């Protein structure tokens, strides 16, 4: 689990949002795996603007945060879960490291700020989910 807090924006895996994301919805897309909602108070967390792919990643299974490389996000295949069928997920990162299914939502972020959240894994491979090109995040 795990979520970023940007002004007025609540951003979380779309298969871990709630029924009062669903209700205060913004913006969501089942093809990346990510659901925007609405918050009344102001959040903390500032959105890296760059092409960064080097980074550190909170693993809630270990209880540690790893510096990862990560490639650019891109279409890639992910397997079949009890959230999703077979299907390739979009603006998707993957790194070498490790990663469980309760990891989603675990925080990736480089020196410009937060980069995405966990969203996929296994087999010593975690990917990471793009939040960066969502500029809007930033503003009303
Ligand atoms: C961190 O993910 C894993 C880690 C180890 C094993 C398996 C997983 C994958 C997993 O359970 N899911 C849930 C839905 C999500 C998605 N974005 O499609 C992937
Ligand atoms: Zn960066």
Same mark, same amino acid.
């Given at each position: ?40 108070? @102001?959040?903390?967390?500032?959105? &890296? ?5 080097? !980074? ?5 299974? =270990?209880?540690? #945060? ?22 390739? @997920?979009?603006?998707?990162?993957? &790194? ?5 299914? !309760? ?5 990736? =972020?480089?020196? #410009? ?28």
């Amino acid at each position: 689990s795990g979520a970023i807090y940007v002004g007025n924006y609540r951003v979380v895996n779309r298969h871990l949002a709630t029924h009062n994301d669903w209700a205060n919805l913004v913006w969501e897309d089942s093809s990346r795996d990510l659901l925007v909602s609405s918050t009344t108070a @102001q959040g903390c967390d500032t959105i &890296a603007r760059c092409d960064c792919q080097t !980074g550190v990643y909170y693993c809630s299974s =270990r209880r540690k #945060h790893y510096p990862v490389s990560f490639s650019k996000p891109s279409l890639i295949f992910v397997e079949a879960s009890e959230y999703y069928p077979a299907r390739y @997920q979009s603006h998707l990162m993957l &790194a070498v490291g490790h990663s469980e299914p !309760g990891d989603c939502g675990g925080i990736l =972020r480089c020196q #410009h700020g937060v980069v995405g959240i966990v969203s996929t894994g296994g087999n010593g491979l975690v990917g990471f989910a793009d939040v960066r090109d969502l500029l809007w995040l930033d503003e009303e």
